[PDB]
Symmetry: C2
Subunit: 287 residues, 2 copies
């Protein structure tokens, strides 16, 4: 029933618009460049002439313009049409940008939600898809089913509009560093003639291990106490130096491993040699 | 039931001997430092006086010392007693250290397996526990049940004795880099007043994502083809710069993320701006 507008038809905007069409919502789409939305119009979407007209077609307005200046130059001149509607910004930025956008929106009577998409664009709309939301609570609760359609696992994280980005930046810090180590381990093995698909089945043993450490590292971090009950940081530093040694011998770039080693070395230098790996947060905070 | 000897009663050695006692094997143990194996002796193990006596008590001899020279300094004076037996060296080395030990074993007629333990000491003996072995094939197959008692996910990875270390260093490259990013993501959040255990439940969504990328990166890596069907490296570099800048704004050490950015940046400069994340292996190989 509820009409929704998607402004910006890049990859993200196209995927978001597709999810709304799948769920059965009337969808209006606007793109600066023609032909981005033709597949969606063939699937039932209505293409709008102007951003102002697009805004007027929706109670919920998703903005998916990736560049900041362009997004602001589109939204601010149509602030009067946005009043009384729910504006949802889905692009990945910084937590401060989300609060500054929040301050603009309430000066013009716009209920504002800042969002973060946490899954690849192909997974948008699935039950498993995770999306973070922060801002006006009544806006999220009123149109909860719309956001569930974009993500089954989509979650609200508080009224402070920067909290979506905080949650987002915390997870993708973990994700991209892990992907860096994933590629690097495969490279290290490839230097000894082992195919990556020979290692891949065994990396599921360390995936389930990682899942356990996620909770254990979280408790130690909030407690400010790292037990070191199993293992010790000084030994963990040593094992990392073995990976460094072998990778440097094979001619690989080791700037990441050196940085991982150096932050842990800092924590050891601050007296945590007997503590668990969680104690490396002291090295990260005190460079 | 085959008699087994465990030489070296550090954390790893005590656990390996414990798993063998749990499974019901006749176990003989030896440690340089007194009182290390009293708990094991109370559980049925027999403490040996000399390394030679320990060796003579076992058809399979596990060595669990810390340094390879130390392992050799115990094994070379008792090389005559090991002849005709199966020697399993479980200590963490380099693939080259393991290949040199292979030659010494051959000179004395010892079937030699080099091992790597992939799970925490507390998981040794469990069904899910993974252990890598490389070397004499008939030695692994004849005493396979012995090695599955150390870890039900035990895997023999080939006749090259350095392959156990190769697989090991490849996996813990991924693991320790991930733990570095895990601690760092938690730190970033804590700077905005979000407790780590509020974020931890959502990190299970990104672990399942990581599990998927493990296979995709492996296929991409062995194929030498990096199709960025969804996403692209040039955009992924940009998103990482959002985390980097936001993290140094908050006074955190960002050397890991900077190095992650730079390895991917190198790959972009090598012409892979349109390729997937898998193309960052080119940055790792050509620094």
């Amino acid at each position: 029933i509820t009409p929704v507008t998607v402004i910006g038809l890049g990859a993200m905007g196209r995927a978001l618009a597709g999810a709304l069409l799948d769920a059965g919502y009337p969808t209006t789409v606007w793109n600066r460049t023609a032909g981005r939305g033709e597949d969606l119009v063939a699937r039932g979407a209505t293409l709008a002439a102007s951003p102002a007209e697009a805004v007027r077609a929706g109670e919920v307005v998703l903005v998916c313009v990736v560049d900041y200046a362009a997004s602001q130059a589109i939204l601010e001149p149509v602030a009067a049409d946005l009043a009384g509607r729910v504006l949802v910004n889905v692009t990945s930025d910084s937590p401060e940008r989300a609060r500054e956008a929040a301050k603009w929106a309430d000066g013009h009577g716009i209920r504002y939600l800042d969002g973060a998409v946490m899954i690849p664009t192909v997974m948008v709309g699935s039950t498993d898809a995770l999306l973070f939301y922060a801002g006006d609570k009544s806006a999220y609760d009123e149109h909860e089913q719309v956001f569930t359609s974009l993500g089954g696992q989509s979650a609200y994280v508080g009224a402070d509009h920067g909290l979506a980005a905080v949650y987002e930046l915390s997870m993708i810090d973990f994700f991209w560093t892990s992907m860096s180590g994933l590629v690097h381990g495969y490279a290290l093995a490839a230097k000894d003639g082992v195919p990556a698909t020979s290692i891949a089945p065994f990396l599921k043993a360390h995936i389930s291990l990682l899942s356990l450490l996620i909770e254990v590292t979280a408790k130690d971090l909030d407690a400010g106490e790292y037990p070191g009950a199993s293992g010790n940081l000084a030994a963990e530093v040593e094992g990392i130096e073995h990976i460094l040694h072998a990778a440097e011998l094979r001619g690989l770039d080791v700037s990441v491993l050196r940085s991982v080693r150096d932050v842990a070395r800092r924590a050891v230098d601050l007296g945590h040699g007997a503590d668990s790996w969680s104690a490396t947060v002291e090295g990260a905070r005190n460079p």
